[PDB]
Ligand binder design. Structure first.
Ligand SMILES: [Cl-]
Ligand SMILES: [Cl-]
Ligand SMILES: [Cl-]
Ligand SMILES: [Cl-]
Ligand SMILES: [Cl-]
Ligand SMILES: [Cl-]
Ligand SMILES: [Cl-]
Ligand code: NA
Length: 129
């Protein structure tokens, strides 16, 4: 599924991402835009043989099992395919573990390079939340 900006803001709000560990909703929407263009089916292969999956591009080296990332961990205890669902619940629950992991949203390279220190409130402007 390709989400609308406000549709995704509403979904993330319902799943408790607004101000989760101090990150306002606009941060999560901004990261999703630049990681996946709001497409739950996005996949991208890394030089190391790991893959990134879903609207928040969660990596198979640490967070999910895809059966082809040798010597990887499965810290969210899910198959990486669960992250491609139109239902974002698995992606949001896994993201909450990642952001708790010590580096905050700096885990998402697109957030650090394209959202951090910008007016992220712009991403939820005009939405009924
Ligand atoms: Cl947009
Ligand atoms: Cl915000
Ligand atoms: Cl594996
Ligand atoms: Cl594991
Ligand atoms: Cl699993
Ligand atoms: Cl959803
Ligand atoms: Cl933080
Ligand atoms: Na893995």
């Amino acid at each position: 599924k390709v989400f609308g900006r406000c549709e995704l803001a509403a979904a993330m709000k319902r799943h408790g991402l607004d101000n989760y560990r101090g990150y306002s909703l606009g941060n999560w929407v901004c990261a999703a835009k630049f990681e996946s263009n709001f497409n739950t089916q996005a996949t991208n292969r890394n030089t190391d043989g790991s893959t990134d999956y879903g609207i928040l591009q969660i990596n198979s080296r640490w967070w999910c099992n895809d059966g082809r990332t040798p010597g990887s961990r499965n810290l969210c205890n899910i198959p990486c395919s669960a992250l491609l669902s139109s239902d974002i619940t698995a992606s949001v629950n896994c993201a909450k573990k990642i952001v708790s992991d010590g580096n905050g949203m700096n885990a998402w390279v697109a957030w650090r390079n394209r959202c951090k220190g910008t007016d992220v409130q712009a991403w939820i402007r005009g939405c009924r939340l």
